[PDB]
Amino acid sequence: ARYLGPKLKLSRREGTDLFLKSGVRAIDTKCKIEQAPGQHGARKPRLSDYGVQLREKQKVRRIYGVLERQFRNYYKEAARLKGNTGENLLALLEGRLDNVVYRMGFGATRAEARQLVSHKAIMVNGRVVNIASYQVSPNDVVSIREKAKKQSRVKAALELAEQREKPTWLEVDAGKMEGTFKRKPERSDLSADINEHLIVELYSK
Amino acid sequence: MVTIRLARHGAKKRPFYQVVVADSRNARNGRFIERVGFFNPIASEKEEGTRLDLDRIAHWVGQGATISDRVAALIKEVNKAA
Amino acid sequence: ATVNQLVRKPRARKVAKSNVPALEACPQKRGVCTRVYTTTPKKPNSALRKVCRVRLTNGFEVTSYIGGEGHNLQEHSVILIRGGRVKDLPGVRYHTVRGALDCSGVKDRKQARSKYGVKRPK
Amino acid sequence: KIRTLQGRVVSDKMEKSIVVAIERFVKHPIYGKFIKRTTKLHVHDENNECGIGDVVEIRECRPLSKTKSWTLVRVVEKAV
Amino acid sequence: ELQEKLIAVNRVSKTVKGGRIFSFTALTVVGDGNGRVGFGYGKAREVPAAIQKAMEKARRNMINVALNNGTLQHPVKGVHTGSRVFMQPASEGTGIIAGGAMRAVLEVAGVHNVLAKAYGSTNPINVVRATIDGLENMNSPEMVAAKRGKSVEEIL
Amino acid sequence: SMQDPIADMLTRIRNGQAANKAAVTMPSSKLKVAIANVLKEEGFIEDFKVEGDTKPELELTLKYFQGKAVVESIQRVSRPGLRIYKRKDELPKVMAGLGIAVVSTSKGVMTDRAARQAGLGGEIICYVA
RNA sequence: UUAGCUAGUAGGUGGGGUAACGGCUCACCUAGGCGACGAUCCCUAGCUGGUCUGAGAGGAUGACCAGCCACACUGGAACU
RNA sequence: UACCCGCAGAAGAAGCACCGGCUAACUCCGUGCCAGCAGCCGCGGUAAUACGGAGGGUGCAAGCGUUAAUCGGAAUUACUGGGCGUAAAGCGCACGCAGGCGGUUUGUUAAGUCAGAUGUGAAAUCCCCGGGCUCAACCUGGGAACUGCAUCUGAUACUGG
Ligand SMILES: [Mg+2]
Ligand SMILES: [Mg+2]
Ligand SMILES: [Mg+2]
Ligand SMILES: [Mg+2]
Ligand SMILES: [Mg+2]
Ligand SMILES: [Mg+2]
Ligand SMILES: [Mg+2]
Ligand SMILES: [Mg+2]
Ligand SMILES: [Mg+2]
Ligand SMILES: [Mg+2]
Ligand SMILES: [Mg+2]
Ligand SMILES: [Mg+2]
Ligand SMILES: [Mg+2]
Ligand SMILES: [Mg+2]
Ligand SMILES: [Mg+2]
Ligand SMILES: [Mg+2]
Ligand SMILES: [Mg+2]
């Protein structure tokens, strides 16, 4: 129920970095991410109107580590909710337990955060949750459990989460290994290289 | 005759009764005259577990609607609580 | 044209019959082969297609088209028939599905093995 | 007060009975056209003070025969 | 500045005494992306020349549209020779709900949210003219108030 | 045969606007005067004046703003072959508010905004935009 | 490309019958009743809240559940 | 039993469809209008990105494709929302019954229409706000809705008497 394969072919296909690596190694040195994978990546194919929308949705899906069915359910929920459909979909995508714990900095990558969530290491509001799709509400308390506070990979992720960008909607503290979800992130708060309209145009069919 | 009884509408291993007034010659969860509150044996704390309508229960018992065993054992609990 | 005419004559539909009458709105039907042979397509392209006139259980007798290369089926063979016609063959409206009760699958098949009923190689 | 229906009479060649016609003005559920629909009924017109064409007023009381459950009240429009 | 975009390329032919000589046609839509839009239909012996021929005419034959902040003012319909277009103002987040040669020209023009529908023959050459006439004929509240003689709040 | 005076009036004013007529004279009626009052109260026409003792005539004067006609489309909605009646909450909205839909109601012949403010429906007559 | 159907049939008087009104039934009298707003006849079909699809209007449909009707090898009948 | 806790080992756990355009994905090998593919356009006559295999790529995922039915696209039965000179569409023409519509003013009625109220429109289902199942599916409380009908009290511009 999740991708089990190369973590850089998808990034090469999309054309940009998908943040699937921790960041210790440079993205250019890690792989030849300039062209699409396979034996025909040298050519530059002209992408169609459906092609660009499909590529954008696949990029978003691979970045957030979800499947097609879960993405469709999230799109349905975003359309059901009030306000901007794309912004609501983005907020719901960046509201999962693995995503929020990765943003806090307890996991190196999305896969590492999802594994930590699954293996019963993440606790929300003093409660054990092993669901990778567990939505978090404003004013919650995510925390590393006492047994898992002594993990070398966890503390490595904690020390490696600082040199990169810092979200302005989370309240994190590595001393006690816990954070708080202050408020729902905004579109300007999130990344600005994602075309929201492409996903809704693709799903309007 | 008219009887105040329950009707299961929850799921497997998670019962939830809808206390209703129904004719005796009817199914357990079939046709009922009116709905009077509900009951949940697995209701968690800090949440309602019984919301019986004592006014309607008294109105029906004044017309002769018999009260079944569990609803009779729950109306006394409701009266004791408030 | 006008509401006064339309109330007298309601706008009738344009219902069209299905292209698979012998199925009687059924995905699959079991039949017994009666005449297995080879035919030739029409003018645009020349070839030698493999066809079989089969009597269905309900009573209809139709002409199917064997897919792939290699078919051990013959007369008095129980086969399963699904919808879908062949464009370049007049008369055929159904396809014999391989991997059926007696229709053996295509030998040494590696791609699209499910469409021809081939076990996954080790 | 009492629900009464006013309609034109059709036939009166029956003993203590007449045939009334009611013209209800309804709108077409599909095209929105306003058409008229007949509501022919049999009325137990005791002491038949009615001819052909004159409008009458009837009320439902009870089933009096196999095919009538309406009785006359007053006759308006009697002049021809 | 501009957001020039090619819609589609078509290959035409013309028989002559010696034989048949081919030719290419290009349809392009240009605009500043805020309130202006223009279309260009060029023809040349080759694809690279035809696209530039269409682009130049589209640039020099633009039309200014008095659109809303992100959408169009009021729902409108445009009628052309073979294509009919219907455009309705949507809400924020819907996107350019269009198809064929309408979504591209709508995105180039500047609108971001609109529901578009094509009735009749859905050819790009006619549908582009239909969808630009639909935006040309529509007016703004200030524009309609100017001819009315009242204020926007009065004619709200 | 003349079977819709309101449609005749709408056709006359539309043709006058199309042909750049200063004013359009025609036989008048009470409903025509009521509709002309609404049309003048919204700036769609310049003015009007009933002239005549036995056969009154309306003399509606068109308005031209920067050459182009002020009124874009006047469409007869409820024609005498299909009557259309709408409630207070089901009234139409021409050009999302930029146009009007004349409605004859119990209080008279008012517009969409007036009918909605008063809280009652009526039957529509025509859309003016 | 189903146009005339209906003689207990329409109505009336009286009797009988049902827990109840009623040609429900009987004797008599009137010749009426339905029908191009589709009578009569043929094929098909349990109905509804609902379900799928559709922006909407609409189209299809009656899986589960719930409300109603009919049936219990076929047909006829009556008793408690 | 749900659930919690200790054992050890990354083990016991991924396949299907497609790759000429519609539609996201290209290169060789084997044949040579034969073998074969196909929903359409159509391919194979020795350079097949269309047949079979391989390499590579794309989509979905404990599911993947085919088949059968329904709705959409089909504005292709168009009341919303078409046309009739030439593509299909004005009876050869005229009269006329039922029917459809109907110039202009006043008074009256208020049937349609418009306003308000009452009863009903079962529960269930959809939607909105919350809660419980570790999330979700699922259950549940309230609200809205059930676009309808009947009655009462008024409004009189329009249609109707
Ligand atoms: Mg799954
Ligand atoms: Mg939304
Ligand atoms: Mg008697
Ligand atoms: Mg549709
Ligand atoms: Mg049933
Ligand atoms: Mg293909
Ligand atoms: Mg349709
Ligand atoms: Mg047409
Ligand atoms: Mg012709
Ligand atoms: Mg001809
Ligand atoms: Mg002629
Ligand atoms: Mg003739
Ligand atoms: Mg009235
Ligand atoms: Mg009302
Ligand atoms: Mg919850
Ligand atoms: Mg309900
Ligand atoms: Mg009048």
Curated annotation (Swiss-Prot), chain B:
<comment type="similarity">
    <text>Belongs to the bacterial ribosomal protein bS16 family.</text>
</comment>
<dbReference type="GO" id="GO:0003735">
    <property type="term" value="F:structural constituent of ribosome"/>
</dbReference>
<keyword id="KW-0687">Ribonucleoprotein</keyword>
<comment type="function">
    <text>In addition to being a ribosomal protein, S16 also has a cation-dependent endonuclease activity.</text>
</comment>
<dbReference type="GO" id="GO:0000028">
    <property type="term" value="P:ribosomal small subunit assembly"/>
</dbReference>
<dbReference type="GO" id="GO:0005737">
    <property type="term" value="C:cytoplasm"/>
</dbReference>
<dbReference type="InterPro" id="IPR000307">
    <property type="entry name" value="Ribosomal_bS16"/>
</dbReference>
<keyword id="KW-0255">Endonuclease</keyword>
<keyword id="KW-0540">Nuclease</keyword>
<dbReference type="GO" id="GO:0022627">
    <property type="term" value="C:cytosolic small ribosomal subunit"/>
</dbReference>
<comment type="subunit">
    <text>Part of the 30S ribosomal subunit.</text>
</comment>
<dbReference type="InterPro" id="IPR023803">
    <property type="entry name" value="Ribosomal_bS16_dom_sf"/>
</dbReference>
Swiss-Prot record, chain D:
<dbReference type="GO" id="GO:0022627">
    <property type="term" value="C:cytosolic small ribosomal subunit"/>
</dbReference>
<dbReference type="InterPro" id="IPR019984">
    <property type="entry name" value="Ribosomal_uS17_bact/chlr"/>
</dbReference>
<dbReference type="GO" id="GO:0019843">
    <property type="term" value="F:rRNA binding"/>
</dbReference>
<keyword id="KW-0699">rRNA-binding</keyword>
<comment type="similarity">
    <text>Belongs to the universal ribosomal protein uS17 family.</text>
</comment>
<keyword id="KW-0687">Ribonucleoprotein</keyword>
<comment type="subunit">
    <text>Part of the 30S ribosomal subunit.</text>
</comment>
<dbReference type="GO" id="GO:0003735">
    <property type="term" value="F:structural constituent of ribosome"/>
</dbReference>
<dbReference type="GO" id="GO:0008270">
    <property type="term" value="F:zinc ion binding"/>
</dbReference>
<dbReference type="GO" id="GO:0070181">
    <property type="term" value="F:small ribosomal subunit rRNA binding"/>
</dbReference>
<comment type="function">
    <text>One of the primary rRNA binding proteins, it binds specifically to the 5'-end of 16S ribosomal RNA. Also plays a role in translational accuracy; neamine-resistant ribosomes show reduced neamine-induced misreading in vitro.</text>
</comment>
<dbReference type="InterPro" id="IPR000266">
    <property type="entry name" value="Ribosomal_uS17"/>
</dbReference>
UniProtKB/Swiss-Prot annotation, chain E:
<comment type="subunit">
    <text>Part of the 30S ribosomal subunit. Contacts proteins uS4 and uS8. With proteins uS4 and uS5 encircles the mRNA as it enters the ribosome, which may play a role in mRNA helicase processivity. Can be cross-linked to mRNA. In collided ribosomes contacts ribosome rescue factor SmrB.</text>
</comment>
<dbReference type="InterPro" id="IPR005324">
    <property type="entry name" value="Ribosomal_uS5_C"/>
</dbReference>
<keyword id="KW-0689">Ribosomal protein</keyword>
<dbReference type="InterPro" id="IPR014721">
    <property type="entry name" value="Ribsml_uS5_D2-typ_fold_subgr"/>
</dbReference>
<keyword id="KW-0007">Acetylation</keyword>
<dbReference type="InterPro" id="IPR018192">
    <property type="entry name" value="Ribosomal_uS5_N_CS"/>
</dbReference>
<dbReference type="GO" id="GO:1990145">
    <property type="term" value="P:maintenance of translational fidelity"/>
</dbReference>
<dbReference type="GO" id="GO:0005737">
    <property type="term" value="C:cytoplasm"/>
</dbReference>
<dbReference type="InterPro" id="IPR005712">
    <property type="entry name" value="Ribosomal_uS5_bac-type"/>
</dbReference>
<dbReference type="GO" id="GO:0000028">
    <property type="term" value="P:ribosomal small subunit assembly"/>
</dbReference>
<feature type="domain" description="S5 DRBM">
    <location>
        <begin position="2"/>
        <end position="65"/>
    </location>
</feature>
<dbReference type="GO" id="GO:0046677">
    <property type="term" value="P:response to antibiotic"/>
</dbReference>
UniProtKB/Swiss-Prot annotation, chain F:
<keyword id="KW-0678">Repressor</keyword>
<keyword id="KW-0694">RNA-binding</keyword>
<comment type="subunit">
    <text>Part of the 30S ribosomal subunit. Contacts proteins S5 and S12.</text>
</comment>
<dbReference type="GO" id="GO:0003735">
    <property type="term" value="F:structural constituent of ribosome"/>
</dbReference>
<dbReference type="GO" id="GO:0043488">
    <property type="term" value="P:regulation of mRNA stability"/>
</dbReference>
<dbReference type="GO" id="GO:0002181">
    <property type="term" value="P:cytoplasmic translation"/>
</dbReference>
<dbReference type="InterPro" id="IPR000630">
    <property type="entry name" value="Ribosomal_uS8"/>
</dbReference>
<dbReference type="GO" id="GO:0006417">
    <property type="term" value="P:regulation of translation"/>
</dbReference>
<dbReference type="GO" id="GO:0022627">
    <property type="term" value="C:cytosolic small ribosomal subunit"/>
</dbReference>
<dbReference type="Pfam" id="PF00410">
    <property type="entry name" value="Ribosomal_S8"/>
</dbReference>
<keyword id="KW-0810">Translation regulation</keyword>
<keyword id="KW-0689">Ribosomal protein</keyword>
